[PDB]
Amino acid sequence: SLGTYVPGDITLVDSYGNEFQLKNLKGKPIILSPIYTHCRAACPLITKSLLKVIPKLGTPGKDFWVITFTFDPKDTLEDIKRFQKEYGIDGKGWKVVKAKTSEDLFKLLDAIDFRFMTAGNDFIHPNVVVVLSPELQIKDYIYGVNYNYLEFVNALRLARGEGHHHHHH
């Protein structure tokens, strides 16, 4: 939900096995990309679209964090490491992570209003990237699988508390 905060005490584990809490990433805007590693449909499209827009915007780990996270609670460290290598993701400025426990997973998905449902061996789910402020406030949602530059620039400005002086609020 726009304007609400993602809980900072969510524990994530990166594709190198490093554990951290979401609050550890405070200080820069955060681009969050929910996927599952065995998706051969939407998630590669989302991730490939991100690979094409992110370099226009800045340097992950410096200007903002990028966090690809799996919502499939059966994905293990091996799965997220495989996903990272597949897309050439650096793994540090742009991380591929999983939730430590189901509570971490619920809490994250609940905060960003994301729900999924089983469809045979796949999941049905929305295509979304969430942009957070440096304090973990949800500032924008970008939907679909074919991202444009301007929408991301605008989202990052909102994340930084910028691009508002054209209007009295």
TrEMBL record:
Protein name per the record: SCO family protein
Complete-protein stretch covered: 31 to 191 of 232
Residue pairs linked by disulfide bridges in the UniProt entry: C39-C43, C39-C43
Homology family: Belongs to the SCO1/2 family.
Residues that coordinate or bind Cu cation: C39, C43, H125
Keyword terms, alphabetized: Copper, Disulfide bond, Membrane, Metal-binding, Signal, Transmembrane, Transmembrane helix
Entry's Gene Ontology molecular function annotations: metal ion binding
